[PDB]
């Protein structure tokens, strides 16, 4: 099952064009350039993930450009304030295709604990979001897990290869949700370690 | 194999084209550009003349020519900066107050 | 000689293939993918210093390749040249022309 | 005819040198990532391929299939023109380097002079990128960077003039043949350090590093690969000018050239990873007040020593 | 500037270069997620569950 | 007393975490890159201890009205001893590698300086007030939570 934005359609993918599309998606998922955007706590956990004790560089995502033109992925790592919501919208509009959005934290997901007059309740109110991460803050390894989720989503999509030949239509993959996928093993947990130990 | 007349013809053509660029343009920047075209064309003429005779005299006068060109560029661009600072425009007939 | 014309051909092919590869990968970058104040005079000052001292540098370029045949008199002339150049440089430094901050 | 065979062999050697140095620059960027990881107690990119060696191909594919974006109210020709300047100037600066006896592109009688022409033409990339972006922030940043690289370019040839004076010629074969007994790093040590500083600064490397916040896709790739091509160029130049070139006692000469060049590239990596960044005016003062008189005094002392031995 | 502080600065740059070069030979501090499983303390606050009593019903 | 000692322990641990982040970010603002990676490794050691104590890294939410949430786990002293053995050599290494560099000194010394009067009239407290020589720490002038015992 696939989603069009230019709807619900089927997989359209000839075998040579599919192979080149596979290599294009492979090169796109194996090189993701996030935008250096410092909002709040979750950005500090992102730069914790970037450092040597964690080494997100192994996935080829250590670039962290300061310009929206060079960067591909927008990580909303913090609260969407009413003053910074046009700033986030302009920074998203100043990006280039392909563009992916990862919302770090309950602030970026839904507004989090701050149901307040000066906070936008989630960045998905006005920009599309590819991957959400819960946590306040999510740990750096959760950020890497969402990075592999984004890589899996990129490796299955079918973007147009060229702007002169082909269907100019964004083909995102309706992946199986992680809750239903991991319900087979999360329920089977019986005994955990007692909290008195370390 | 290359005639000397061809080299001086090319140098003369570049020089007189630089003369057009100096005359027909009111902008002082293009006037300095045309001046540099003329002095570089005359330096090309000296190099052609020295290369015909097999002597380094043309290259020595070329070195003197480009030294003059560099220093003239410095002075002319400083004067252009002063004109733009104190008049906010580069019109060369705006600086025409002294006459008669 | 065959060696000199062969190396001229090699240099020409080097330049042509470099330019062709660079513009070709420009063409490949453009072809693929789907669509969606007043400055200060200090810049002029340091640039004009650079130009003047590059002409002094070209004179020293001409000198340095032929020190052996010019003899000691060439060393004396270049010493006067370099002393004048250093006097000009000290003049520029001391009056705060080369100091970027005021 | 044997003449055409020799011509074709020379052309093949030249194009082999060209693809080798371009691939070496790209893999040197990959080695930048890996060696920064090694210096910073981590791994760097080591998942895309065997040991991470296929990260470069994926990155180049990503920059190839990125949507190109020339700004709407920019100057198209100048904006696209700055990256071919930044690539081709340093590539043709590498073009004069003799990597091995017989494996030379062109035995130009100017040589290091031709490197000086290419280094002079290299500043137009920064200036054109600043102006053509139609951004006053990029304009100010490129004005500062171009003033930096002019103030450090003004003594580049004067640093090289000690090696030129000791060789007695502008040809690089004579330069690498005059280092048979002793390498030029020993007499021209002050020239060596001034040339190293100037070569780092004209390549806009750390700690001499915005005017790139408007480029994206393959133009940014052009700028960056041209910068690494310049790194390889400066390393090979200092190998050929101060460390004997290809000359070595035991190993084949190309192995010596590659080992010295790789040592100088890893010195580039260490210089970026170690030193912090000085302020703009401090860099200006160091480039004007210190380096230029040092090169002048070095040239004077070199000439005095050369004329002293030849009584 | 004064030659003394210039030489001291050059020596300090050499010291920083040598210290990073010594760091090049050290052992990696990278915890290799996801190949290396991330150790978490027993009382770490993550995914929320509802448990069961030893009889077998739901505790809530 | 045990509540006071526990809260002092966690406050000092988070103070070391914040100071490590501050020093690394200042050094990165000057231009050196490696100390931010090394200081975040040290912050990961701190986060290991804090995860063992409370159950979270950044916002433990562990203090309570009248005490703390849970008790100290069985074996926290091993992690604290490991951290106290890990820190000082690395801190001296950070000083030698970046904080004694003369380029960093030229960038940072004498920049945005103010005396005690400017700190007092603007309400600046902390290191900005104690760099003026005004010895005013809340932990010593108006003590709280058992800081007198240390
Ligand atoms: C752009 C297209 C270029 C196509 C190729 C142009 C010719 C390249 C070769 C060349 O310039 O050869 C002339 C000269 C040879 O120098 P050399 O071998 O030392 O002298 C022979 C004996 N007098 O070599 C030179 O004069 C080299 C200096 C000029 C190089 C210009 C490079 C582009 C700018
Ligand atoms: C005569 C020697 C040069 C001279 O006058 O040196 C003293 C001069 C004073 O320095 P100042 O202009 O205050 O600023 C330099 C910042 N350290 O310092 C300078 O002019 C800076 C150093 C210039 C050295 C030029 C070459 C001197 C001879 C070798
Ligand atoms: C292909 C191979 C090439 C690879 C690279 C190898 C060479 C790297 C060269 C890097 C050059 C960096 C130059 C930096 C110059 C900085 C000058 C400056 O002004 O620095 C500021 C600092 C303080 O300035 P000051 O005015 O005194 O401040 C008072 C106000 N607070 O002033 C100071 O701290 C004074 C000291 C400045 C630096 C002195 C020179 C250091 C050179 C770099 C270290 C080289 C180590 C050996 C490298 C390998 C050699 C084989
Ligand atoms: C082959 C072409 C390319 C573009 C390559 O893909 C790579 C990306 C090139 C290079 C030169 C590698 C590394 C430099 C870099 C872009 C970032 C390091 C970094 N990393 C951080 O986090 C870990 C930071 O902390 C916030 C930083 O400040 C800094 C500065
Ligand atoms: S979700 Fe929590 S940790 Fe993240 S920015 Fe919001 S308050 Fe901070």
Q: Where are the domains of chain C?
A: 2-95
Which chain E residue shows the shortest CA-CA distance from A198?
Answer: E41
Residue written as tokens 């990129």? A154
Chains E and D touch (3+ CB pairs under 8 A): yes
Helix (H) or strand (E) holding A75: strand A73-77
F116 near F132, Cβ under 8 Å?
A: yes
Is the preceding omega at residue E58 within 30 degrees of 0, hence cis?
no
C2-95 placed in CATH 3.40.50.1820 = no
Separation CA A70–CA A99 (nearest Å): 11
Separation CA F132–CA F126 (nearest Å): 10
Structural domain includes residue B12: yes
Structural domain includes residue B95: no
Instruction: Give F57→chain E minimum CA distance, Å.
Output: 9
Does any CB of chain F come closer than 8 Å to the CB of residue A58? no
Name the pairing type of β-strands A170-173 and A2-5. antiparallel
**Tokens in use for D58?**
């994926």
Q: Structure resolution in Å?
A: 3.2
A143 near A133, Cβ under 8 Å?
A: yes
Nearest to D247 by CA among D102, D103, D101: D101
E9 CA → ligand 2 middle, Å: 19
DSSP count for chain D of H helices, then E strands? 13, 0
F78 near F42, Cβ under 8 Å?
A: no
Instruction: Give E47→chain A minimum CA distance, Å.
Output: 9
Q: Which residues in chain A (118-177) have CB-CB distances under 8 A to chain F?
A: 136-137, 139
Name the neighbours of D, counting chains with at least 3 Cβ pairs within 8 A.
Answer: A, C, E, F
F53 CA → ligand 1 middle, Å: 73
D278 CA → ligand 1 middle, Å: 40
Structural domain includes residue B96: no
Ligand nearest to the CA of D30: 4
| Closest in E15, E19, E45 to F56, CB measured | E45
User: Atom 8 (ligand 2): residue with closest C-alpha?
Assistant: C94
Residues of C in contact with D198 (CB under 8 A): none
Helix (H) or strand (E) holding D191: helix D189-202
CATH number for B17: 1.10.287.3510
Return the biggest CA–CA distance within chain F: 50
Tell me the CA distances in angstroms from C77 to B64, C58, C59, D164, E30, one per residue in order: 17, 15, 11, 19, 63
| Measured CA angle at F27 (ends D262, F22), to 5 deg | 140
Nearest to C6 by CA among D98, D4, B46: D4
A61 CA → ligand 4 middle, Å: 9
Which residues make Cβ contacts (< 8 Å) with residue D175, sequence separation at least 6? D111, D112, D163, D164, D167, D169, D184, D240, D241, D245
DSSP category for residue E52? B
* Cβ(E5) – ligand 3 distance below 6 Å: yes
Write out the residue range of the structural domain in which residue B59 sits.
4-87
Structural domain includes residue B64: yes
CA dihedral B70→B72→B77→B82, nearest 10 degrees, is 140
Separation CA D172–CA D111 (nearest Å): 6
* Cβ(C15) – ligand 1 distance below 6 Å: yes
Tally of domains in chain B: 1
D30 near D55, Cβ under 8 Å?
A: yes
Name the pairing type of β-strands A170-173 and F67-68. unpaired
F41 CA → ligand 4 middle, Å: 18
* Cβ(D282) – ligand 2 distance below 6 Å: no
Does any CB of chain A come closer than 8 Å to the CB of residue D65? yes
Separation CA D177–CA D162 (nearest Å): 16
**Tokens in use for C55?**
């002409």
Separation CA A127–CA A100 (nearest Å): 10
F75 near F65, Cβ under 8 Å?
A: no
Instruction: Check CB contact under 8 Å for D42 and A26.
Output: no
A130 near A101, Cβ under 8 Å?
A: yes
Which chain A residue shows the shortest CA-CA distance from E46?
Answer: A135
Decide: helix, strand or coil at residue A65: strand
Instruction: Give D144→chain A minimum CA distance, Å.
Output: 19
Separation CA D41–CA E27 (nearest Å): 7
* Cβ(D196) – ligand 3 distance below 6 Å: yes
CATH class belonging to A2-187: alpha beta
Ligand 2 atom closest to C94 (CA): 12
**Residues forming beta bridges with residue A119, ordered by sequence position:** A81
Ligand 3 atom closest to D267 (CA): 4
Does any CB of chain A come closer than 8 Å to the CB of residue F40? yes
Ligand 2 atom closest to E2 (CA): 17
Structural domain includes residue B19: yes
Separation CA F90–CA F74 (nearest Å): 28
Main-chain dihedrals φ then ψ at residue A120, nearest 5 degrees: -80, 130
Which residues make Cβ contacts (< 8 Å) with residue B1, sequence separation at least 6? none
**Tokens in use for A5?**
């934005």
Residues of A in contact with C31 (CB under 8 A): 162, 164
| Closest in D43, D271, D290 to E28, CB measured | D43
Residues of D in contact with F33 (CB under 8 A): 36, 40, 272-273
Interior/surface letters D25-54, b for 16+ CB within 10 angstroms, e for the rest: bbebbbbbbbbbbbbbbbbbbbebeeebeb
D272 near D158, Cβ under 8 Å?
A: no
Decide: helix, strand or coil at residue C32: strand
Separation CA D242–CA D189 (nearest Å): 9
Name the pairing type of β-strands A131-133 and A170-173. unpaired
Chains C and E touch (3+ CB pairs under 8 A): no
F89 near F103, Cβ under 8 Å?
A: no
| Closest in D39, D41, D276 to F107, CB measured | D276
DSSP count for chain A of H helices, then E strands? 6, 8
* Cβ(D109) – ligand 1 distance below 6 Å: yes
Residue written as tokens 């007059």? A117
Separation CA D49–CA D55 (nearest Å): 7
Separation CA F40–CA A140 (nearest Å): 12
- State the CB neighbour count (10 A cutoff) for residue E2: 7
Return the biggest CA–CA distance within chain D: 68
Structural domain includes residue B72: yes
Which residues make Cβ contacts (< 8 Å) with residue B47, sequence separation at least 6? B58, B59, B62
Terminal Cα distance for chain E, rounded? 76
**Residues forming beta bridges with residue F68, ordered by sequence position:** F63
Instruction: Check CB contact under 8 Å for E1 and D274.
Output: no
Residues of B in contact with C58 (CB under 8 A): 63, 66
Residues of E in contact with F70 (CB under 8 A): 43
Residues of A in contact with D57 (CB under 8 A): 27
Instruction: Check CB contact under 8 Å for A193 and E42.
Output: yes
User: Atom 29 (ligand 2): residue with closest C-alpha?
Assistant: D293
Separation CA D199–CA F38 (nearest Å): 30
Return the biggest CA–CA distance within chain A: 64
Instruction: Give E23→chain D minimum CA distance, Å.
Output: 6
Is the preceding omega at residue B56 within 30 degrees of 0, hence cis?
no
**Residues forming beta bridges with residue B87, ordered by sequence position:** none
Sign of CA dihedral D166, D167, D171, D177: negative
């Amino acid at each position: 099952d696939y989603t069009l934005t230019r709807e619900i359609v089927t997989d359209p993918l000839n075998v040579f064009m599919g192979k080149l599309n596979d290599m294009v998606n492979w090169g796109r998922k194996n090189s993701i350039w996030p935008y250096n955007f410092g909002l709040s706590c979750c950005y500090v956990e992102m730069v914790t993930s970037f450092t040597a004790v964690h080494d997100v560089a192994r996935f080829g995502a250590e670039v962290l450009r300061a310009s929206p033109r060079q960067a591909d992925l927008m990580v909303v790592a913090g609260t969407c304030f009413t003053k910074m919501a046009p700033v986030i919208q302009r920074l998203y509009d100043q990006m280039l295709e392909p563009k992916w959005v990862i919302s770090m934290g309950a602030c970026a997901n839904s507004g989090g604990m701050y149901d307040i007059y000066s906070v936008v309740q989630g960045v998905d109110k006005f920009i599309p979001v590819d991957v959400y991460i819960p946590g306040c803050p999510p740990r750096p390894e959760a950020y890497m897990q969402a990075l592999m989720l984004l890589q899996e989503s990129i490796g299955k999509e079918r973007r147009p290869l060229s702007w002169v030949v082909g269907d100019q239509g964004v083909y995102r993959a309706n992946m199986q949700s992680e809750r239903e996928r991991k319900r087979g093993e999360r329920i089977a947990v019986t005994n955990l370690r007692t909290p008195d130990e370390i | 194999m290359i005639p000397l007349q061809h080299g001086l013809i090319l140098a003369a053509i570049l020089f007189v084209l630089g003369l057009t660029g100096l005359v027909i343009r009111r902008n002082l920047l293009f006037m300095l550009i045309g001046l540099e075209i003329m002095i570089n064309a005359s330096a090309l003429a000296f190099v052609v003349a020295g290369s015909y005779w097999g002597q380094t005299d043309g290259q020595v006068m070329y070195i003197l020519a480009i030294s003059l060109a560099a220093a003239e560029a410095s002075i002319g661009l400083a004067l252009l900066l002063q004109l733009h600072r104190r008049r906010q425009n580069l019109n060369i007939d705006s600086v025409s107050e002294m006459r008669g | 000689s065959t060696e000199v014309i062969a190396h001229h051909w090699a240099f020409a092919i080097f330049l042509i293939v470099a330019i062709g590869l660079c513009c070709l990968m420009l063409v490949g970058g453009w072809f693929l993918g789907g669509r969606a104040l007043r400055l200060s005079a200090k810049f002029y000052l340091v640039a004009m210093f650079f130009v003047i001292f590059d002409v002094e540098a070209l004179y020293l370029f001409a000198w340095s390749t032929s020190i052996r045949e010019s003899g000691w008199v060439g060393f004396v002339e270049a010493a006067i040249f370099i002393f004048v150049l250093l006097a000009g440089l000290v003049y520029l430094v001391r009056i705060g022309a080369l100091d970027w901050t005021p | 005819s044997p003449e055409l065979i020799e011509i074709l062999l020379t052309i093949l050697k030249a194009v082999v040198i060209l693809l080798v140095v371009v691939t070496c620059g790209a893999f040197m960027s990959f080695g930048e990532r890996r060696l920064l990881g090694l210096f910073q107690n981590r791994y760097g990119p080591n998942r895309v391929g065997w040991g991470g060696s296929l990260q470069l191909v994926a990155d180049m594919i990503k920059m190839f299939f990125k949507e190109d974006w020339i700004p709407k109210f920019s100057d198209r020709v100048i904006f696209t023109l700055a990256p071919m300047i930044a690539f081709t100037s340093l590539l043709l600066a590498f073009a004069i380097v003799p990597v091995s006896p017989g494996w030379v592109v062109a035995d130009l009688n100017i040589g290091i002079l031709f490197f000086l022409m290419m280094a002079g033409l290299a500043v137009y990339a920064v200036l054109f990128a600043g102006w053509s972006s139609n951004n006053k922030y990029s304009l100010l940043g490129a004005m500062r960077a171009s003033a930096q690289t002019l103030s450090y370019e003004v003594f580049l040839g004067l640093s090289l003039m000690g090696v030129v004076a000791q060789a007695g010629s502008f040809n690089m074969t004579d330069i690498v043949n005059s280092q048979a007994h002793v390498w030029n790093v020993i007499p021209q040590f002050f020239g060596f350090i001034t040339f190293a500083i100037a070569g780092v600064a004209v390549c806009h490397r750390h700690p001499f590093d915005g005017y790139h916040i408007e480029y994206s896709g393959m133009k940014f790739g052009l700028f960056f690969v041209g910068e690494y091509i310049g790194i390889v160029t400066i390393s090979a130049l200092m190998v050929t000018l101060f460390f004997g070139g290809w000359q070595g006692p035991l190993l084949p000469p190309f192995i010596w050239f590659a080992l010295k060049t790789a040592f100088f590239m890893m010195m580039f990596i260490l210089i970026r990873a170690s030193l912090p960044r000085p302020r703009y005016d401090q860099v200006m003062s160091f480039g004007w007040k210190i380096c230029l008189p040092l090169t002048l005094i070095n040239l004077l002392v070199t000439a005095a020593v050369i004329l002293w031995q030849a009584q | 500037m004064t030659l003394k502080e210039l030489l001291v600065g050059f020596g300090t740059q050499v010291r920083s270069i040598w210290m990073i070069g010594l760091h090049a030979f050290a052992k990696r501090e990278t915890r290799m997620y996801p190949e290396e499983p991330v150790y978490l303390p027993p009382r770490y606050r993550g995914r929320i569950v509802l448990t069961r009593d030893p009889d077998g019903e739901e505790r809530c | 007393d045990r509540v006071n000692v526990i809260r002092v322990m966690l406050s000092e641990l988070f103070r070391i975490n914040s100071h490590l982040l501050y020093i690394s970010t200042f050094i990165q603002d000057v231009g050196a890159m490696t100390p931010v990676f090394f200081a975040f490794t040290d912050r990961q050691k701190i986060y290991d201890l804090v995860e063992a104590i409370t159950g979270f890294r950044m916002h433990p939410a562990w203090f309570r009205i009248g005490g703390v949430a849970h008790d100290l786990p069985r074996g926290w002293d091993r992690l604290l001893r490991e951290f106290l053995d890990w820190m000082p050599k690395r801190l001296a290494s950070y000083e030698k590698a970046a904080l004694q560099n003369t380029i960093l000194k030229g960038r940072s010394q004498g920049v945005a300086a103010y005396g005690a009067k400017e700190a007092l009239e603007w309400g600046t407290t902390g290191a900005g007030l104690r760099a003026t020589g005004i010895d005013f720490d809340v932990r010593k002038a108006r003590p709280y939570s058992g800081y007198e015992n240390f």
